[PDB]
């Protein structure tokens, strides 16, 4: 015997459709919440698909979702099984990028591009079974940086320079197959998720400026590590060695309200908490040996 998670459907199943599940004997399946029974609506990432919400909303929900590999497809039932940490678990290479031995694979929400290519395997009446990409860790650090820069250029667009620079970020180039990352922007106006995220960096990028000035000058007096004196001049923010304009010291806040200065610090870290989901990529699998043709590979579970 072994612990399992039954997941029966509801719509009638053609026998030919069950054979597409036989190709998915061992692949990652996100689950909104652990349960001993799960409706096929809850099954897959499709339950959280959204219209105006951007890619960030999927990643922010998927990180809380519990991963669960497929075990043994059968008749009306689905035998899902949750991996235990510290044990190896084979995973199907649903991910577009070929796996390499020893990489720290980590889940990311899917990013299907423009022209149609691979189709979703289960379009069972409006609902369809999308699956998150399985990607090596260094690329997952890369794809996250791409979408955020594209949101920084979500405002300006008419200039040709931004118009081309987004096209370069759109086209990733890596080992073996190359791919294209769809633009989060659509119909000029930005999606609300990227606007919430791009402002979260814009707050820290600017609110940190004036607020940190008073805190540098006082702590630097000790000259303990001595670096704080260099830190005081780090805030001038310039490249060229500017001459005799005579504000050699960084600009400092003035006439701030005694209580509002506390709230500005509260407005600082709160932006960091909303931004935190993009900041980190928890590992979920670590591949060891890889099967030929990269169809699948054994991966010890992590997290």
């Amino acid at each position: 015997m072994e612990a399992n998670i039954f997941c029966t459907f509801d719509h009638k199943l053609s026998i030919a459709d069950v054979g597409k599940l036989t190709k998915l004997v061992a692949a990652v399946v996100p689950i909104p919440q652990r349960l001993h029974l799960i409706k096929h609506y809850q099954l897959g990432l499709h339950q959280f698909v959204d219209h105006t919400r951007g890619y960030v909303r999927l990643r922010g929900l998927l990180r809380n979702m519990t991963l669960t590999l497929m075990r043994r497809v059968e008749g009306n039932q689905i035998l899902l099984h949750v991996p235990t940490h510290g044990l190896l678990y084979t995973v199907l290479n649903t991910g577009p990028v070929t796996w390499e031995k020893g990489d720290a694979l980590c889940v990311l929400p899917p990013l299907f591009h423009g022209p149609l290519a691979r189709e979703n395997l289960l379009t069972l009446g409006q609902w369809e079974l999308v699956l998150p990409w399985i990607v090596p860790m260094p690329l997952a650090l890369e794809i996250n940086q791409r979408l955020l820069i594209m949101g920084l250029f979500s405002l300006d667009r008419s200039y040709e320079e931004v118009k081309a620079a987004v096209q370069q970020l759109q086209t990733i180039t890596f080992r073996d197959a190359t791919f294209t990352i769809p633009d989060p922007v659509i119909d000029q106006h930005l999606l609300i998720d990227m606007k919430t995220a791009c402002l979260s960096m814009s707050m820290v990028a600017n609110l940190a400026s004036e607020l940190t000035m008073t805190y540098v000058r006082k702590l630097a007096l000790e000259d303990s590590s001595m670096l704080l004196v260099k830190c005081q001049e780090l805030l001038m923010r310039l490249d060229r060695e500017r001459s005799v304009g005579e504000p050699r010291t960084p600009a400092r806040p003035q006439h701030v309200s005694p209580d509002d200065e506390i709230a500005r610090l509260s407005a600082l870290f709160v932006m960091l908490r909303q931004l935190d989901d993009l900041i980190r990529e928890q590992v979920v699998f670590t591949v060891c040996d890889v099967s030929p043709d990269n169809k699948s590979a054994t991966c010890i579970f992590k997290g």
Binding site: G86, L88, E100, K101, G102, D103, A104, M137, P138, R175, S225, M226, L227, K230, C231, E233, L234, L238, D239, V283, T286, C288, D289, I300
Partner: protein, 290 residues
């Protein structure tokens, strides 16, 4: 269901016959193979076979060494498995006498050129490196079959002997005169900054500290010299963007009491090394810190 199904003691696999024996017992066939006791049926440890060029067989032929994959800009080979000792010549931590010592052993048709792949790039070494584990049962050949240990204790087959990790003495350091009974191991790359190029050192740090917050704080003191170079390069070189004074990562844990100094002797050459004894493996992600 019957109460016997829940009141029963958990099933002992040793009380059960081996699964290959069950198919034979049903038909009373007698194959030449002796399946009455499967070997390697009881191993918490996980392993993977690694085919490696013969030019890196040195030192690793003694069990216990930190394999680390190194992706390279060349598309073939895509992932050479550098020995940790082979990376020490790149390290500034190694003493100039120790650097000249081991380096003569590494001359080869392949390993001697392996160092060139490090110098060519602009990005920092940790972006290429990826910890794999530890050696056990080298095959020794023109294409040696190294067996990495992804997790669990190193040991000889059939539990005949517990292999020990070999940490070179120059990279080792202690955070306290009085160690705790437990202390996690942390491989660390440190990036001191200089004009033409960074010259990273390597460090392995057993420490009773386990929580990541308290772990990085003590490093901020001992490596404050390189930390001063880190901010100094930033004000010096706009457009240039150095990052991360170092990179901690979890590697495993040891009982501390078992540790004692030792030395490996390959090709009649002594090499003093710290020697963790019963060292379980618990690898983790690189964790950058500034």
């Amino acid at each position: 269901m019957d109460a016997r199904a829940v009141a029963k003691r958990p099933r002992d696999p040793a009380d059960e016959d081996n699964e290959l024996v069950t198919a034979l017992k049903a038909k009373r066939e007698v194959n030449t193979i002796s399946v009455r006791y499967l070997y390697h049926a009881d191993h918490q440890a996980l392993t993977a076979r690694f085919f490696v060029p013969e030019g890196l067989v040195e030192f690793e032929a003694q069990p216990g060494a930190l394999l680390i994959r190194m992706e390279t800009g060349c598309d073939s080979p895509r992932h050479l498995y550098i020995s940790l000792y082979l990376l020490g010549i790149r390290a500034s931590n190694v003493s100039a006498s120790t650097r000249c010592l081991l380096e003569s052993v590494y001359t080869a048709s392949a390993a001697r050129a392996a160092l060139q792949w490090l110098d060519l790039g602009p990005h920092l070494l940790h972006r290429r490196l990826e910890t794999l584990g530890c050696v056990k049962t080298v095959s020794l050949g023109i294409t040696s079959l190294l067996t990495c240990v992804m997790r669990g204790y190193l040991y000889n087959t059939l539990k005949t002997e517990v292999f020990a990790l070999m940490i070179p003495k120059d990279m080792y350091l202690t955070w306290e005169e009085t160690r705790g009974r437990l202390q996690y191991v942390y491989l660390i790359i440190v990036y001191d900054y200089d004009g033409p190029e960074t010259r990273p050192g390597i460090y392995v740090l057993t420490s009773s500290i386990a929580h990541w917050q308290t772990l990085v704080d003590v490093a901020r003191g001992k490596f404050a010299r390189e930390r001063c170079s880190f901010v100094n390069r930033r004000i010096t070189r706009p457009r240039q963007i150095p990052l991360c004074t170092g990179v901690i990562q979890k590697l495993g844990w040891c009982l501390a009491d078992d540790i004692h100094t030792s030395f490996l002797v390959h090709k009649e050459l002594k090499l003093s090394v710290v020697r963790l004894d019963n060292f379980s493996v618990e690898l983790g992600d690189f964790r950058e810190f500034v």
